[PDB]
Every structure is written in structure tokens, then in C-alpha cells.
Amino acid sequence: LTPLAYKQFIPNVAEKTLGASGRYEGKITRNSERFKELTPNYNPDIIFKDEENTGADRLMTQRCKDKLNALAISVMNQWPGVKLRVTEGWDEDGHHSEESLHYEGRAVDITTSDRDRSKYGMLARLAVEAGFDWVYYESKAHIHCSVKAE
Ligand SMILES: [Ca+2]
Ligand SMILES: [Zn+2]
């Protein structure tokens, strides 16, 4: 269980390559038809910042849900008392560089619920083993994980 290092990513290739999360498919919108592909995650074992208060955070694809929920489990087991925390989910706001998987509900930024920056390296390792298609120690303040489109 070798935690990831700052700026490290597993698998060791570019996020949108085929061996990872795959191709950008197109910004999903509130109104657009694809939007119905998103369902809200109401997992009580997961903490959603939701600074938008829109509930956008909870909105993700099914695969993204699946992996996030597995990760929720292994996080508690790993550090009892602590829970998984999502800081950023689906983006309506448009504050991600063009072609981010956030626009499609396929990517999340996470921390532990206590913001102990020391557990992040390990959090990323758990996200890899929860089955996230690309895991990346994007910042010292959060792990970025994303999933293939299905
Ligand atoms: Ca948020
Ligand atoms: Zn991200």
C-alpha cells in the first residue's frame, strides 16, 4: 500500500488516454439531455462540501458513484472516525481548464473529512484500489479522481 506522492498519478499516463479515463465527450449542461445521465449521490458516509448549495456536488455518473461509494467504505475502515469528503463534483460554474472531466460528472476532488493533509497520499492509494480509472495528487489540498464514460 504505497501512498502516492505529490503530483503523482496512477496509472502513470495522461488522464484522457485510453488506458485511463478515456476521451472528453462534451460538457454536460443543466438543460442538455445528457444531464439525465447524472444521478445524485446521497451516501451518508460521504461528506459533500456543496458550497454552491445547488447540490451539484452530489451529481455524478453511475460509474463515478460506484467507485466513490467503494472508496467511502475503505476510507472509514482505514481511518475509523474519519469519512470521505468531496470538495468538488460536477462543475456548472466553469472554473476548470477546458476539457475537464468535472464538466461531465466523471471527476471529483476529495479529501478526508478532517483535512489532515498527511492522509491524502494514502487517500489517493485507496481511490486507486476503489477502482478509479485515473487518480492524481493534483494539489497538496486534494486528490483528483475520475472514471471512464460508459
Ligand atoms: Ca462543492
Ligand atoms: Zn479535479
UniProtKB/Swiss-Prot annotation:
Changing residue 50 to V: Moderately reduces Ptch1 binding in vitro and signaling potency in chicken embryo neural plate explant assays compared with wild-type sequence. Changing residue 150 to Q: Does not affect signaling activity in any of Shh signaling assays and causes no apparent defects in cholesterol-mediated autoprocessing reactions. It is a lipid-anchor. It comes from the Eukaryota. N-palmitoylation by HHAT of ShhN is required for sonic hedgehog protein N-product multimerization and full activity. It is a prerequisite for the membrane-proximal positioning and the subsequent shedding of this N-terminal peptide. It is found in: Cell membrane. The dually lipidated sonic hedgehog protein N-product (ShhNp) is a morphogen which is essential for a variety of patterning events during development. Induces ventral cell fate in the neural tube and somites. Involved in the patterning of the anterior-posterior axis of the developing limb bud. Essential for axon guidance. Binds to the patched (PTCH1) receptor, which functions in association with smoothened (SMO), to activate the transcription of target genes. In the absence of SHH, PTCH1 represses the constitutive signaling activity of SMO. Multimer. This is Sonic hedgehog protein N-product. It comes from Mus musculus. The lineage of its organism: Eukaryota, Metazoa, Chordata, Craniata, Vertebrata. The chain holds residues 40 to 189 of 437 of the full protein.
